[PDB]
Design a protein around this ligand. Structure first.
Ligand SMILES: O=C1CCCc2cc(-c3ccnc(Nc4ccccc4)n3)ccc2N1
Length: 252
């Protein structure tokens, strides 16, 4: 628990826009340690009323330690800005990869889905749910392993948008959404308006291109049920035939 300050860093390349400022490559002066520094404006956190949402997410994200979860090393603030000290993820966002490749093969998808599920299984067994399990929020390590970070309906389950009660089953719906997007190149409830997307999610209307294989259709269909109780456990996902046939890493 070292209290940091901006003078302890040399800032570099902008890595991305985080909607609340920007994330920069940085290097710790004393150690030479390379990391990522998320720069948030304090005036924009008050006036989006998320200062609690930040404090609790930072608390949670600091204690969690998994190879497929991006490490938060710490934080500090000055007058204007708050700084998150993050692991640096050399290979960037899954979003960008998907923009590049347009879509992913079954192997890369099934691997990603494993890595997610693993990091979620761990998350659940500390009573942590997530909401924004979306490509903008998944990063890639030097080995190209998936890392979850950043603790718009497109990825939200029916119970959530409807305003119903929700449990750890939200994250299962997310996996189905992502599994679909990874294979097809767009999420399954995509639309041109919010209102429509809302309808699509709420009545669970999705269809498959021809090229999506029977095994993947099975797993996605299983994951995207309206009824949370009907969605499989994470263990079952890791042990799905399509997953085990196509993944590269193993389940845990
Ligand atoms: O939600 C978002 C939108 C997407 C941009 C973004 C990126 C990071 C981040 C954290 C650690 N390593 C990296 N490496 C990286 C490497 C190459 C390209 C881009 C990012 N990037 C954190 C938060 C964040 N904000």
């Amino acid at each position: 628990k070292r209290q940091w300050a901006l003078e302890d860093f040399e800032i570099g390349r902008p890595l991305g826009k985080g909607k609340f400022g920007n994330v920069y490559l940085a290097r710790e002066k004393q150690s030479k340690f390379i990391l990522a520094l998320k720069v948030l404006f304090k005036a924009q956190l008050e006036k989006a009323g998320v200062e609690h949402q930040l404090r609790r997410e930072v608390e949670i994200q600091s204690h969690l330690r998994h190879p497929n979860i991006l490490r938060l090393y710490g934080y500090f603030h000055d007058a204007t800005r708050v700084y998150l000290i993050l692991e640096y993820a050399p290979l960037g966002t899954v979003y960008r990869e998907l923009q590049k490749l347009s879509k992913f093969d079954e192997q890369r998808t099934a691997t990603y889905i494993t890595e997610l599920a693993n990091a979620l299984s761990y998350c659940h067994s500390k009573r942590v749910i997530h909401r924004d399990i979306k490509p903008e929020n998944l990063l890639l390590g030097s080995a190209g392993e998936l890392k979850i970070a950043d603790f718009t309906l497109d990825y939200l389950p029916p119970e959530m948008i409807e305003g119903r009660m929700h449990d750890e089953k939200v994250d299962l719906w997310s996996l189905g959404v992502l599994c679909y997007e990874f294979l097809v190149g767009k999420p399954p409830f995509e639309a041109n308006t919010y209102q429509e997307t809302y309808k699509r999610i709420s009545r669970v209307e999705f269809t498959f291109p021809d090229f999506v294989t029977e095994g993947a259709r099975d797993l996605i269909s299983r994951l995207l049920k309206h009824n949370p109780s009907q969605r499989p456990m994470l263990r079952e996902v890791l042990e799905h035939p399509w997953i085990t046939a196509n993944s590269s890493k193993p389940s845990n």
